[PDB]
Amino acid sequence: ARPRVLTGDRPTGALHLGHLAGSLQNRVRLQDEAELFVLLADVQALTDHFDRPEQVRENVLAVALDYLAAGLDPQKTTCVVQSAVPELAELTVYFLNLVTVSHLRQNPTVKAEIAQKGYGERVPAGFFVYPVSQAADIAAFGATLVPVGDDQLPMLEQTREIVRRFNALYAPVLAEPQAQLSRVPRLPGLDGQAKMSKSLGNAIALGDSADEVARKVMGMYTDPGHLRASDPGRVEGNPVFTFLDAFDPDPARVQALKDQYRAGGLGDVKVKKHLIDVLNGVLAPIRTRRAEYERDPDAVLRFVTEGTARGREVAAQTLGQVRRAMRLFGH
Amino acid sequence: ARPRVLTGDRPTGALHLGHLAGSLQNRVRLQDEAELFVLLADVQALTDHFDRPEQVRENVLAVALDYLAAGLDPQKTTCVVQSAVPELAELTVYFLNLVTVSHLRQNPTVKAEIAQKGYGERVPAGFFVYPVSQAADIAAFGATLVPVGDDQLPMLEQTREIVRRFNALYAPVLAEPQAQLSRVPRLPGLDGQAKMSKSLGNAIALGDSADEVARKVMGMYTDPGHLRASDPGRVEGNPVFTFLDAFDPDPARVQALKDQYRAGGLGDVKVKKHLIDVLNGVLAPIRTRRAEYERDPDAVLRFVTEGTARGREVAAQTLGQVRRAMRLFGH
Ligand SMILES: N[C@H](Cc1c[nH]c2ccc(O)cc12)C(=O)O
């Protein structure tokens, strides 16, 4: 517990195996060698889900349950609800003056999302400027380390420009955050697509039953050219093997499996059955804690209402110095 | 009282004659005909003066003084400093999700302001966005009536739109403001321009001495082509007449000079000379009123502090409604 690390998830659905490999595991590690803060960004979730406020509301508790199921320690990690800390909002609006529409339009990651969203020009304002609300999140909690995939680096980098701009314009009161680069490639979807998502229908939820997990794995895309066991099959592009690199404890088995697959005679059945055993080893403990916490709804609530209290006070402090630094009337 | 009315100014310096005929005297009277709220657009002032925060701070107290001297009674008008009401920023954020960047792009007023400031695509985000920030101002204070210069109609119309869309998506807890058109269009500058502003240097502040006000009138643009008294002059384009037209109480008297001046026996001096006093007359009391308060500064601060408290009170009530209407987690 030395540098303050900030991370988060916009509450839009249940977390899945892609988040586990992509961020959860790394976060379970950080809670022990840093002060970890996780933001359930329901406000940000609203920049595009403003038409589904029920969906966002319901998932704040569900993801929380997921963080816990994943192994995030209530006594270690500060879980906070973005909605319950208006200080952030207050900061984003001040941050908006420190950034140009031109530079906000150039963010490649948001540009890409607007692209995949098919918005066109009809981009909802809140979404267009979310990178700054994120910057507000970072500075307000006074985080100095932020786990980031190269896809969020422009978000982080903008944050750096903002704090830099704020300190120089007013007073050097905000900490410049630093990135904690990558988590190695992103987990692909069951049918082999680049992205794993509930939406795409190709995900395995952390809460999926061991039976379900078995089934989903059984129907996984493999190698179009591999038609029968005897045949030789390709590993590259074959998610069954990508999953194995991200969760199989012993690469010796993995590498061995890979061999015999390119050779021939190693059908997808024998490989998949082995993924199932590795996934169940990774997921089982997570299933148990999830079910446990289901019996103790109050415990999940305590997890967030208290993280929030803490988060609220921290952000409250920062705005304090921000208000003073900006020379706001009465400060 | 009866309806809630919201009016305000961007604290960037002393108020001038334009504000007077622009609204000041208007609210003076609507001050007992309704619940009048006057917002010192502290924050909106930064989307333009984000590099000169000192300038703003200093002028909050200076404009408030201006307000009192202009006739506003502490017992009937709630003066509110925007920055001390963080609830407004909160609501601004939520509102951003209700409009598209392409819609903000076609606001005729902001576009004109933008072109004047030579920002180009390099428009600060906060500025490009101030229209909704104001809509938030309106909705948070529950204002049902909002005086508006011809020029601020687009903004007014945007507020209703956003309020409308908010009520449908979430719940009908916000009131659509209705406009109060004025007669006297944007008082022109001494320059002969369309705008009077300290920025353009063509203004007669409410604090200027009898000597100055007179000096300002004498250098007031009039009519080229009209070189010597004798000659026939024309009222179109002449600031002095459009000045009398807004500060002179005897219209028969006005339409009089309008005759002679088209003939040729009414020296611009004579016109000016008159008008100068018609201004000293409308300004006489204001001057005496300012001295009093200038000697009881404690009172000005009181006006601001008590009002701001009351106002936050109101904002807090609306946000709570808003927060539950949006089904934000926990409400
Ligand atoms: N009057 C403004 C600043 C402003 C912001 N919100 C409102 C609401 C109602 C007003 O009457 C004015 C304001 C200006 O002229 O920019």
A198 in a labelled binding site:
yes
Is there a contact between B138 and B161 (Cβ–Cβ < 8 Å)? no
Strand partners, A145: A5, A178
| Distance from C-alpha of B175 to C-alpha of B167, rounded to nearest angstrom | 9
Q: Does B192 touch chain A (CB under 8 A)?
A: no
Q: Is A293 part of the contact surface with chain B (CB cutoff 8 Å)?
A: no
Q: Which CATH number does the domain A189-296 belong to among 1.10.240.10, 2.130.10.10, 3.90.1150.10, 3.40.50.720? A: 1.10.240.10
Is residue A123 less than 8 Å (CB to CB) from chain B? yes
Q: What is the DSSP code string of B264-318?
A: S---HHHHHHHHHHHHHHHHHHHHHHHHHHHT-HHHHHHHHHHHHHHHHHHHHHH
Smallest Cβ–Cβ distance between B101 and the set A123, A323, A328 belongs to: A123
Residues in CB range of B215: below 8 A, 6 or more apart: none
Answer yes or no: do B124 and A89 touch at CB < 8 A: no
Rounded CA-CA distance B265/B255 in Å is 15
d(CA A318, CA A6): 15
* Sheet architecture: strand order including B145-148: B77-81, B35-40, B4-9, B145-148, B178-181
B101 in Cβ contact with A73 (< 8 Å): no
CATH of domain B198-296: 1.10.240.10
H/E element, B203: none
- Return the bridge partners of A16, or none: A205
Task: Give the whole-angstrom CA distance, residue B181 versus residue B156.
Answer: 11
Element (H, E) at A237: none
Phi, psi (rounded to 5 degrees) for A38: -120, 125
Cα–Cα distance measured from residue B327 to residue B174, given in angstroms and rounded to the nearest whole number: 15
For A45, list phi and psi in degrees, rounded to 5: -60, -25
C-alpha–C-alpha distance, residues A278 and A247, integer Å? 7
Q: How far is the CA of B8 from the centre of ligand 1 (A)?
A: 5
Residue type, B13: G
Q: Where are the alpha helices (DSSP H) in chain B?
A: 17-19, 25-30, 42-49, 53-69, 87-96, 101-104, 108-116, 125-140, 153-169, 210-218, 241-247, 251-263, 268-294, 297-325
The count of other CB atoms within 10 Å of the CB of residue A201 is 10
Cβ within 8 Å, pair B329-A125: no
**Of residues B208, B198, B290, B280, the one with CA closest to residue B243:** B280
Is the Cβ–Cβ distance between B25 and B71 less than 8 Å?
A: yes
Q: Which candidate, B325, B1, B17, places its Cα nearest to that of B198?
A: B17
> Which token pair is A240?
């069954």
- The CATH class for the domain spanning B1-197+297-331 reads alpha beta
- Beta strands B77-81 and B35-40: pairing type? parallel
Q: Which residues contact B185 (CB under 8 A, 6 or more apart)?
A: B149, B150
Distance B7 CA to ligand 1 centre (A): 6
Single out the residue of A2, A3, A8, A13 nearest to residue A308, CA to CA.
A8
Considering only CB atoms, which chain B residues are within 8 Å of A47? 96-97
Domain residue ranges of chain B, discontinuous segments joined by +: 1-197+297-331, 198-296
Read off the tokens for B106. Answer: 């076609």
List, as own/partner pairs, every contact residues A199-205 make where C-beta atoms lie below 8 angstroms and the sequence separation is at least 24, other chains included.
A199/A13, A203/A16, A203/A17, A203/A18, A204/A16, A204/A17, A204/A279, A205/A14, A205/A15, A205/A16, A205/A17
Alpha-carbon distance A323 to B2, whole Å?
35
Sign for the pseudo-dihedral over CA of B32, B33, B35, B37: negative
Fold match between B1-197+297-331 and B198-296?
no
CA–CA distance, A102 with A115 (Å, rounded to integer): 17
Name the residue at shortest CA distance from atom 12 of ligand 1: B8
DSSP category for residue B219: T
Residue B228: left (phi > 0), alpha (psi -120 to 50), or beta? beta
* Gap from B283 CA to chain A (nearest CA, Å): 29
Question: If we measure between CA atoms, which residue out of A13, A2, A56, A65 comes closest to residue A38?
Answer: A65
Overall resolution, Å: 3.7
Interface test with B, best of A52, A55, A97, A133 (most B CBs within 10 A): A97
Q: Is A241 exposed, middle or buried (0-12, 13-18, 19+ CB in 10 A)?
A: buried
Count of other CB atoms within 10 angstroms of residue B10: 21
Assess A116–B contact: CB distance below 8 Å, yes or no: no
Strands (E) across chain A are located at 4-9, 35-40, 77-81, 145-148, 178-181
Residues with CB under 6 A from ligand 1: B 6-10, 41, 44, 134, 137-138, 146-147
Which method, experimentally, gave rise to this model?
Answer: X-ray
Question: What radius of gyration, in Å, describes the C-alpha atoms of chain B?
Answer: 22
A122 half-sphere exposure, CB direction, 13 A CA radius = 3
**Phi, psi (deg, nearest 5) at residue A110:** -70, -35
| CATH for the A1-188+297-331 domain, from 3.90.940.20, 3.40.50.620, 3.10.20.30, 3.40.50.300 | 3.40.50.620
Q: Could you give the C-alpha distances from A120 to A46, A72, A195, B96, B102, in angstroms and in order?
A: 19, 39, 22, 17, 10
Two tokens at A241? 């093997």
**In Å, how far are A126, A131, B34, B171 from B163, measured between CA atoms?**
16, 25, 22, 10
CB contact at 8 A, B239 and B189: yes
Hey, which residues 211-270 in chain A have their CB within 8 Å of chain B? none
Note whether B93 contacts A126, CB cutoff 8 Å: yes
Nearest 10 degrees: CA dihedral of A163, A165, A166, A171? Answer: 110
Q: Do A125 and B94 touch (CB under 8 A)?
A: no
Chain B: closest CA distance from residue A321 (Å) = 14
Residue B195: burial class (beta carbons within 10 Å; 0-12, 13-18, 19+): middle
DSSP bridge pairs for A58: none
For chain B, say whether A42 makes contact (Cβ under 8 Å): yes
Note whether A101 contacts B: Cβ–Cβ < 8 A: yes
